[PDB]
């Protein structure tokens, strides 16, 4: 018995939410893990914005030289038929104008609703008090009625590996 599973590396933030890395970063981590289970992933080799980021596989923690934080990381897995298995990413635009990916469980839920031709999706049952409007491509706070923009891109697919039995 062999099954396929999508590899999504994730780091725990200050709100106790597991945040995903990008698919480019996750491929680089898995290549270091294949060669050395106790190695260090130097994300500065990938892009200049990731210079202060180091992921230590020896202790499974993220090290940031620009802030000093030590935050746990995990090697999580999702279903190949979900958005990370293809490369589909849903992102929302923060106050600084930067695009930020939703949590992976929410990203997969948004993509499932979009292809089911749902005009909108309510995330309240999943903890987020937000409404996703695909017609205006926006996210609305249920309490304040204020909105942010969101977009869909076909980025890189996250790595896929084999789980035995
Ligand atoms: N999808 C999201 N995921 C994580 N954080 C978010 C998301 N949307 C907004 N935030 C954060 O919540 C804060 C503002 O929430 P928002 O609902 O936009 O404000 P308001 O309460 O004024 O409507 C910001 O710090 C923003 O970074």
Residue numbers in the entry: 20 to 184
Give the article text.
The WWE domain is a relatively under-researched domain found in twelve human proteins and characterized by a conserved tryptophan-tryptophan-glutamate (WWE) sequence motif. Six of these WWE domain-containing proteins also contain domains with E3 ubiquitin ligase activity. Here, we present novel crystal structures of the HUWE1, TRIP12, and DTX1 WWE domains in complex with PAR building blocks and their analogs, thus enabling a comprehensive analysis of the PAR binding site structural diversity. A highly conserved feature in all determined structures is the recognition and therefore the interactions involving the adenine ring of the ligands.
We solved two crystal structures of DTX1 in complex with ADP, with each structure having one ADP molecule bound to either of the two WWE domains. Our efforts to obtain a DTX1 co-crystal structure with both WWE domains bound to ADP were unsuccessful despite having excess ADP in our crystallization setups. To gain insight into why ADP ligands were only observed in one WWE domain in our DTX1-ADP structures, we investigated conformational differences by comparing the bound and unbound WWE domains in the same structure. While the core structural elements appear to be conserved, some loop shifts are observed in both structures, with most differences occurring when ADP is bound to the WWE2 domain as compared to the unbound WWE1 domain in the DTX1-WWE2-ADP structure. The observed differences are in the loops that interact with the phosphate groups and may reduce the surface area of the ligand-binding site in the unbound WWE1 domain of the DTX1-WWE2-ADP structure, which therefore might discourage binding in the second site. Comparing our DTX1-WWE1-ADP and DTX1-WWE2-ADP co-crystal structures with the RNF146-iso-ADPr structure revealed that the residues at the corresponding distal ribose-phosphate moeities binding sites in DTX1 WWE domains may not support high affinity binding to iso-ADPr. Specifically, neither Trp30 nor Trp111 would allow for a direct hydrogen bond to the distal ribose oxygen, while residues in the loop regions (30–38 in WWE1 and 111–122 in WWE2) would not contribute to high affinity binding to the distal phosphate group. Our biophysical data, however, supports DTX1 preference for iso-ADPr over ADPr, which may indicate a mechanism where it recognizes PAR via both iso-ADPr and ADP moieties.
